[PDB]
Amino acid sequence: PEPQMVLSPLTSAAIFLVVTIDSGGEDTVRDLLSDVASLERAVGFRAQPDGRLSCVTGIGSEAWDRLFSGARPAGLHPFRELDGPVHRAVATPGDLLFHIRASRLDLCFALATEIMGRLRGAVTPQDEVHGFKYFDERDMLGFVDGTENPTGAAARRAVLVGAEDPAFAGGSYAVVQKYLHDIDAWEGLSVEAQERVIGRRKMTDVELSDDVKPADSHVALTSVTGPDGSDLEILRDNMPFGSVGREEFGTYFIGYARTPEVTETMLERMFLGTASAPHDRILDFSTAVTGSLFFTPAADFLED
Amino acid sequence: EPEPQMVLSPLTSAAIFLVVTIDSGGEDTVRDLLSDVASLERAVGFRAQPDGRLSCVTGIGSEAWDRLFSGARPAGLHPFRELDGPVHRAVATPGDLLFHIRASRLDLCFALATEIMGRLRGAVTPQDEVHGFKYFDERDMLGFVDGTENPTGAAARRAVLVGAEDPAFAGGSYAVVQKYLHDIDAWEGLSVEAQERVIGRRKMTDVELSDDVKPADSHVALTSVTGPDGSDLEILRDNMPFGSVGREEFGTYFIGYARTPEVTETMLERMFLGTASAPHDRILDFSTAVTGSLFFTPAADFLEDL
Amino acid sequence: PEPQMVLSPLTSAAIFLVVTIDSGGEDTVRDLLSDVASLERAVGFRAQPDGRLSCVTGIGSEAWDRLFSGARPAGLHPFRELDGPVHRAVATPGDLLFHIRASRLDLCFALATEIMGRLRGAVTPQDEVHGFKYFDERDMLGFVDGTENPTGAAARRAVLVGAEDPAFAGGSYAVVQKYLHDIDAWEGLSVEAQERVIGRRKMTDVELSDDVKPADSHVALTSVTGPDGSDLEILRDNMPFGSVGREEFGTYFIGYARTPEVTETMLERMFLGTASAPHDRILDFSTAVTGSLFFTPAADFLEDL
Amino acid sequence: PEPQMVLSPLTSAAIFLVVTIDSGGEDTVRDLLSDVASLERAVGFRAQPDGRLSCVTGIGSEAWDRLFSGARPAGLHPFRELDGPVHRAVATPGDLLFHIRASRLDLCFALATEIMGRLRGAVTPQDEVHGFKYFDERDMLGFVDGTENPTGAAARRAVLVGAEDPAFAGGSYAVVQKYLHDIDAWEGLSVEAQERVIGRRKMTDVELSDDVKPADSHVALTSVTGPDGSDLEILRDNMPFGSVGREEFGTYFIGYARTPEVTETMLERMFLGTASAPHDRILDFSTAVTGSLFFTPAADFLEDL
Amino acid sequence: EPEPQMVLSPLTSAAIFLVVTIDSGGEDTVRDLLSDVASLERAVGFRAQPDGRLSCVTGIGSEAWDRLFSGARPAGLHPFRELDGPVHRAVATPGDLLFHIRASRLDLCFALATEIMGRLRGAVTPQDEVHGFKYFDERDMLGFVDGTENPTGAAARRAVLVGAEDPAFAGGSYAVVQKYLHDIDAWEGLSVEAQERVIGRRKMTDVELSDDVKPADSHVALTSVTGPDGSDLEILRDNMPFGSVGREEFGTYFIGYARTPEVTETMLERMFLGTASAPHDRILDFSTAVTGSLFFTPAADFLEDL
Amino acid sequence: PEPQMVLSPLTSAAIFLVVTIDSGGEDTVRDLLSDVASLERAVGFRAQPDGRLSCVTGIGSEAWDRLFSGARPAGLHPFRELDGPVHRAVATPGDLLFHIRASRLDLCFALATEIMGRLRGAVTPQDEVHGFKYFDERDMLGFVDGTENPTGAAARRAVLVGAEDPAFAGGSYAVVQKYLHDIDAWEGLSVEAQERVIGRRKMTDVELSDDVKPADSHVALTSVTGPDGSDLEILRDNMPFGSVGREEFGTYFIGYARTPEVTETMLERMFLGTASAPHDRILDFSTAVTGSLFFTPAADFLEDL
Ligand code: HEM
Ligand code: HEM
Ligand code: HEM
Ligand code: HEM
Ligand code: HEM
Known part of the structure; x- marks a missing residue:
């Protein structure tokens, strides 16, 4: 079965978008999910052959239960907050992830614009990088x-x-x-x-x-x-x-x-x-300010 | 497993489309050329590795097939049928061989087309070149x-x-x-x-x-x-x-x-x-078809073993 | 008379930095102005021939009076607020402009880091784009x-x-x-x-x-x-x-x-x-949120500080 | 005087367009000539920095007298046919030349399209390569x-x-x-x-x-x-x-x-x-089928019209 | 199961060919090196994603195989066989290890070659470097x-x-x-x-x-x-x-x-x-072989399994 | 007076070739010097627009006097060996320098092949990098x-x-x-x-x-x-x-x-x-194994031979 572009290499540009779904925004979100591959092709085909645009879409544990009834992926659960003696990995809200990559920022921005245009009024932005x-x-x-x-x-x-x-x-x-x-x-x-x-x-x-x-x-x-x-x-x-x-x-x-x-x-x-080690020394110079876990379904699940 | 011709390859920057008909008596020369077309493609294309992206897809029409080959025929291979709508028509025009030549530069396409046509000179009549x-x-x-x-x-x-x-x-x-x-x-x-x-x-x-x-x-x-x-x-x-x-x-x-x-x-x-719901495609109110042909593009090993 | 790179073409990446100079930060700024070309070469030389890194440095009217004691450029004045009947062009604070361009954002970012490293504690950031x-x-x-x-x-x-x-x-x-x-x-x-x-x-x-x-x-x-x-x-x-x-x-x-x-x-x-025209129709779809005017001196002026 | 792009290098793509001016086409032509620099920029700016689009416009001897009053360039005359004992350099009709170059054919084609769209009804195409x-x-x-x-x-x-x-x-x-x-x-x-x-x-x-x-x-x-x-x-x-x-x-x-x-x-x-030589041996393998001569004025001559 | 080294990859614009012999008692250092070569390749090559195209194919000769490994040998592995024609000679020259390093840029090749040879210094003698x-x-x-x-x-x-x-x-x-x-x-x-x-x-x-x-x-x-x-x-x-x-x-x-x-x-x-019909290849009238060596290039997982 | 390409930027490939002139090879060398621009163009043109091929030719002090009569450049002398307490800058033979640059080694090699082909029998190679x-x-x-x-x-x-x-x-x-x-x-x-x-x-x-x-x-x-x-x-x-x-x-x-x-x-x-320094510390990790000095004449001097 056909995965999303989770295996694809690093690119020179990316946009990471994390949103929460508002109360009553479920239908709007479902409709966007069924269209997201179409939107990616709409933008991405313009920049063949070097554009390398992709979008990986992920869904959180709580969001899953609001959007779908029945089967759930076996490993899907909320991010687990880790409170170390010194350093903490925080769990922050996040229902949908869009991981958008291309060789140029314009492609990523154009796709993110289309996605968010369709979700306006149904979601709240949590993070954009x-x-x-x-x-x-x-x-x-x-x-x-x-x-x-x-x-x-x-x-x-x-x-x-x-x-x-x-x-x-x-x-x-x-x-x-x-x-x-x-x-x-x-x-x-x-x-x-x-x-x-x-x-x-x-x-x-x-x-x-x-x-x-x-x-x-x-x-x-x-x-x-x-x-x-x-x-x-x-x-x-x-x-x-x-x-x-x-x-x-x-x-x-x-x-x-x-x-x-x-x-x-x-x-x-x-x-x-x-x-033999109290914590990773990299965390003495690195603070985590978000933390979320998502399931990124096979492409055909979203296409429904 | 048979090896396809490059029919799954992406769009390129440059292309030449060549359609010819086979003259009476030309069948032998054509068969020879069909067996050599992959070798011709490599001869030109290898020069421009790695960004040349030269390819040639060769197709054979229904009537041509019947002239060239005693043996099995592809199940769906027939002449293009004219579609005569009330307003717009899809014309059927002659074509026995198609060469669909693509590269990232026109020079590569032109050089390969030159080599192919040089072989076929006197056995075919050009119908279309784009x-x-x-x-x-x-x-x-x-x-x-x-x-x-x-x-x-x-x-x-x-x-x-x-x-x-x-x-x-x-x-x-x-x-x-x-x-x-x-x-x-x-x-x-x-x-x-x-x-x-x-x-x-x-x-x-x-x-x-x-x-x-x-x-x-x-x-x-x-x-x-x-x-x-x-x-x-x-x-x-x-x-x-x-x-x-x-x-x-x-x-x-x-x-x-x-x-x-x-x-x-x-x-x-x-x-x-x-x-x-619809009389015809509105794109046709701004577009006229002037050629129409159907070809079978065999597996590459088919061409090789003539 | 060598200009800064004000005649150079558009690039695919840019960073625009506008800062104000804190009271008592004048000497640090002058030192940095004298070194900015050296910093640009230090980063830019890494990526020739295609990096196309450049930095144009501008100085505002009020800052000019705090930094320099001699003559002022004839046209240098604070940006003038325009208050139209419908739309307004606001004047916002800005002492120094860094207009950084390259074919890649990393070079702009690396240069911006080096400039701001020197200036920390002497300037307050006003805008970064x-x-x-x-x-x-x-x-x-x-x-x-x-x-x-x-x-x-x-x-x-x-x-x-x-x-x-x-x-x-x-x-x-x-x-x-x-x-x-x-x-x-x-x-x-x-x-x-x-x-x-x-x-x-x-x-x-x-x-x-x-x-x-x-x-x-x-x-x-x-x-x-x-x-x-x-x-x-x-x-x-x-x-x-x-x-x-x-x-x-x-x-x-x-x-x-x-x-x-x-x-x-x-x-x-x-x-x-x-x-003939009450205002530019573009302004019915565009709001100005900053407005500043700077003089970008000849390169030798900055070098000779 | 600013020249047209006559000194510019070879490019990977070009369109050569030669037309003649129909009865009563002169005003339409003059209007296009005044606008060609503008059209070139309109198309060309889209493919900065690598498009390298340029257009050189030339005007033939007879057309000059139809378009412009007063002074003519000293060397402008119709192409002179050369009827050699074996090979001939033919003269053929041509009033305007557009030599369009870019790094990609699409830019040349777009510009040619805009030029010809303005000249429809005023000109007759003679050659396009x-x-x-x-x-x-x-x-x-x-x-x-x-x-x-x-x-x-x-x-x-x-x-x-x-x-x-x-x-x-x-x-x-x-x-x-x-x-x-x-x-x-x-x-x-x-x-x-x-x-x-x-x-x-x-x-x-x-x-x-x-x-x-x-x-x-x-x-x-x-x-x-x-x-x-x-x-x-x-x-x-x-x-x-x-x-x-x-x-x-x-x-x-x-x-x-x-x-x-x-x-x-x-x-x-x-x-x-x-x-020492009856003719150039390249002509035993090369036949001229067009021949025309044009003056390509300074860019500001065209703008001023 | 079976993962080849990059023996199928295309020509590149730069290459370094390094042939070395193993010195007496250098076997342990070489085994260690061999188990790390993939890591070194990644260490250097990841820097120049996506266009660097750095690879390294490592080969082991006949005599070397028996000094390094216990157990089975590849069926085809023997020393290069000298060929003494009348006029022209295909010489056999020493070579235990081959590093075939390719990239789009020489710097990447040189950097990887430097890392490989830094590890092997004391354990090997260079025979050829091109x-x-x-x-x-x-x-x-x-x-x-x-x-x-x-x-x-x-x-x-x-x-x-x-x-x-x-x-x-x-x-x-x-x-x-x-x-x-x-x-x-x-x-x-x-x-x-x-x-x-x-x-x-x-x-x-x-x-x-x-x-x-x-x-x-x-x-x-x-x-x-x-x-x-x-x-x-x-x-x-x-x-x-x-x-x-x-x-x-x-x-x-x-x-x-x-x-x-x-x-x-x-x-x-x-x-x-x-x-x-032909005494010898005419190409050899204008070309002299000055080295000749034969190597087996194992599956990647073999080398890693050390 | 037009210089050789001595002001041109660094490239990703170069060949440096240093040769001495054998007794009797002076005429051969002079002929080559007059043709080197030609040769460069012949090879270089093939790789328009990105090959960036150039060759600068230099001539040492002893060679100058064997090739030319009349006035000599004012500062042209043999490289002066420096015998320091610890490190030495050696002087090594060299009569001609070809500094060849391009974006690709093949272009450098092709031009070097042409040059050396013209000089076979007249020169002995000293250094090639x-x-x-x-x-x-x-x-x-x-x-x-x-x-x-x-x-x-x-x-x-x-x-x-x-x-x-x-x-x-x-x-x-x-x-x-x-x-x-x-x-x-x-x-x-x-x-x-x-x-x-x-x-x-x-x-x-x-x-x-x-x-x-x-x-x-x-x-x-x-x-x-x-x-x-x-x-x-x-x-x-x-x-x-x-x-x-x-x-x-x-x-x-x-x-x-x-x-x-x-x-x-x-x-x-x-x-x-x-x-306040006995020597450059970089020399503690760097040994000079050649040293030569050349005059690189204006391009018009070479052509005029
Ligand atoms: C805090 C910011 C992080 C930084 C700056 C960072 C940086 C790096 C660097 C420089 C390397 C070495 C080169 C490499 O193989 O990529 C590395 C390796 C690695 N990092 Fe991180 N890392 C960070 C966070 C994480 C986290 C949160 C995880 C896992 C949950 C992680 C997992 C790894 C893994 C698996 C490797 C490969 C280790 C190996 O097998 O050699 N990193 N990282
Ligand atoms: C007359 C010239 C034609 C032009 C200029 C043209 C142009 C287009 C354009 C602009 C699109 C929308 C973007 C895309 O998906 O490619 C499209 C879609 C398509 N065209 Fe055409 N087309 C032409 C003829 C044809 C013909 C003759 C066929 C089939 C016999 C065809 C089959 C399609 C199909 C299958 C799609 C995708 C429809 C969908 O799933 O959304 N086209 N074409
Ligand atoms: C909302 C801000 C702006 C946008 C989106 C915008 C956009 C554009 C566009 C699309 C053009 C036509 C293409 C071109 O020649 O560049 C243009 C032209 C121009 N704009 Fe603006 N512009 C803006 C603000 C300004 C401002 C503030 C000024 C001057 C103070 C200005 C001065 C010009 C000039 C001089 C031209 C060229 C006019 C001509 O000679 O044809 N623009 N602008
Ligand atoms: C002596 C230096 C060599 C040179 C300069 C050389 C050059 C060439 C050239 C120019 C071709 C034609 C184009 C092509 O690659 O298909 C060719 C073909 C070939 N060469 Fe060589 N070659 C050399 C040595 C060898 C050796 C030693 C072998 C085998 C042990 C070999 C095997 C082949 C093969 C198999 C072909 C393809 C023939 C075919 O099937 O069409 N070559 N070589
Ligand atoms: C021995 C090998 C040499 C190495 C590896 C080397 C390397 C370097 C490096 C890394 C720099 C700093 C960055 C730069 O501005 O280029 C530098 C600067 C410099 N080097 Fe060297 N160099 C060497 C020999 C020489 C020699 C022999 C000379 C002069 C005879 C020389 C003259 C210079 C000069 C003038 C500068 C610029 C100093 C400044 O104004 O900032 N170098 N060199």
């Missing part, structure tokens, strides 16, 4: 960001619902968190101290050797094997964003996985820690 | 985005490629071509709003009109045909603009691929003969 | 925007200060205004009605002929002839911006001219009208 | 074509009218000829024989040494010295064109020069020959 | 378009990847490398017409000569090999030009992939030792 | 390299001979040195230590503040003011090159300037040091 590529795929911490994403068949196996939930095969689960960074504190570290926080070399993006990589480095904590042997993988399409006057330097985190348990395990390790 | 070009943001000469609702991915394969219904010809497709000339002086006299009602989509933004406002005789309404499965019937269109300003020739070269000609024919009947 | 190209050089009203900009020698003559003010030759004057548009109202007009508001055809960008072009159309009102029969020109580097959730669909207006008088005459025609 | 780049700047004979064109200051001196005709300074003269090639005959020659016809190496574009270069080679006959021993140069913007079904493999020749005497001297040498 | 570059429209140093008849799509997978005939190593391939230097002075003394007869294709247009004019000793005639069933045997070549004008080194770096070495060997035998 | 762009204009030390190059009028003033030596106006002097780097040692330093060696931030390429910039830092030692207070500048077109197997990680240094004394003053400061 316009993301942009930063040099050679860097984030606002200055590190190459996305390197260890799965590709090809390994990506398919890590991201797409299959025979464990066959009515929903071809779907995925998206976790979003908007992070703001303390760039003044971060820039007070040496490069070598930043490398130890992340677990990779800053300029060249080469992973630190195991004898050197700290236990509380980001890469250490988000490296998880299940009882099975295999690495647990997620597909991240994080984008930088910001505003210089407000001193806002951000990473918009979005991670896709076949079940949310994988992403949640990673978050637990980061925010609550392990026996 | 040099197509992309016009702004995938627009046609009417100013509308053209190709939006083409199928992609798996749906395209299912809509376009012959499968187990005709196993000897699996991986083939059917192409219909019509050269249309537009009355641009009449068209440009309409408001944008009236043009949108002819087509059924918004002109600048390419968004479909809502069902409550889209006329029954708009192009999109009449070419939207629901199959038994509840789903719309789909074709893949590779239409290209063409023209000549001095002669006031402003054209759309229509080419549509489908797994069976019955889909394209049903759309044509609705456009030219109308429905209970 | 991240502009982006919209299809085929369109604005948020869906019209091609920039067509009649002067080029070549005509641009230099229209834009650069010359012998009229010789101490400031190679400078220019920038007027900025942030406009928000009422897209719901605009989309209620037919295309033909919109054409009559602007004065050009929407899809093809061809000018309406003089017989059909309304006198209160934008193009008619911003077409001004000099006493010498000669068209008065400005150079506009307008960019779209916006936010869909807030229903913010914007034009960031920036115009460069050799004297502000040209830009002001255009604004007066638009907001106050003429004998 | 859609030219395209062929590999690495080759012509239909398979040679790199344009190499020795002048550049920079040498180009301005070879092409622009100056103080020798001061009322028309910044103009130029264009000669056009459409050539169709006998490719079957050409392809019957070895590469080494082709190189002796042209005077350059086929693959590498290197000029043959003087030891080896034949005197009836194309490059020998079109290399001409002025009485002061200096090289007479023209600027050629020729483009390939063709139709495979009609066996039509063409060179559209267009050459600009500050006086037509230079281009005429080259044509005389090619068609009529010299002491 | 930096290849695209030359015009996919030309080689003889001025001919080079690569044209490479198989594509399913035909390439069938020709290149090991399958059911050696299931433990399914998804692997065999690479043969030969560094050629050309005698350009002698070559450029030939007419174009003579050059075309050596190669068997037209020079400027890359169109194949018809078989009825193609010399039996032309390079294309001799490297056209029909198997038992009359099917063409195919290899995948990623040859690149290289050179130094000052020392008059004008080179072709030959690299050919095949699912068994026998195909590539047959072609080399035909070249260097000739047939009934 | 194929340079390549490294990420965002980085060198092998990982720093952005070229940032503070002069542009515009300042570049012209810094690089072209003028009235100080009027017979040779429009020429320049090129110094070349091939450096190999000890990357293993370099990588043992912290980023912060590397930054102190260079005088700029590694990732962002911003210059270190005056206060923290060491006296023996590269940028400090190559910042030079003349007696009149003016900054002495050179134009650098250095390119990375290397061979991983041989652990050769190189910077090919090439610097143009209107007099050798400017570049020589910088080299003296680097290798022999100053009051």
